[PDB]
Amino acid sequence: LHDSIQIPRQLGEVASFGGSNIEPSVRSCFQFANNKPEIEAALFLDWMRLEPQSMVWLPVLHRVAAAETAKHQAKCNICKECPIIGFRYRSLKHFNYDICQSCFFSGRVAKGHKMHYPMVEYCTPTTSGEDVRDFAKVLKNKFRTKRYFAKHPRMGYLPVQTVLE
């Protein structure tokens, strides 16, 4: 854990992953393993397969490496990019809304719609089943209004959604 967090410490951002305090990670891993005397390979695999807070930089990195040469059949509603190269971000409480990665991280705030709503992240080009499922999710959300849950501050919004390759 210490050797791993050394890399964010070099770049001065280890505080986001919880800082140099590796003990809470040990506490969580033992809580998963019901305080087992020893930890094996499979248990560690399952423990990290659920986005551990301190380790998010391993998968995301590879995920970025998996989305540097991906071309989607869509457009960016803000900068009128066509087609989006790289990541793709789809809205859920709106229809026909998509934004590129740069338009998302930088914050091109077009008047009328904010960016503090749930999103969906796509690395690989999508398929028809994903599109129709997104349509169904949008329709279901359209009748689940009145702000059941809201998150205005950022505080760290890294685990957006899992694509399961």
């Binding site: 690989t124 398929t127 028809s128 089943g129 390759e165």
Partner: protein
Amino acid sequence: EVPDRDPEKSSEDDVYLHTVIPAVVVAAILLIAGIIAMICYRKKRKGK
């Protein structure tokens, strides 16, 4: 011996069969092909 009776009810059924049916079946084939193509066409993610 020369009997002649005319109860013949002529009807143009050959023209109908020769003309309407082929286009109807062609239209049905085109419609089913289009529907199948729309349901299909990138429903599978070829990983790796």
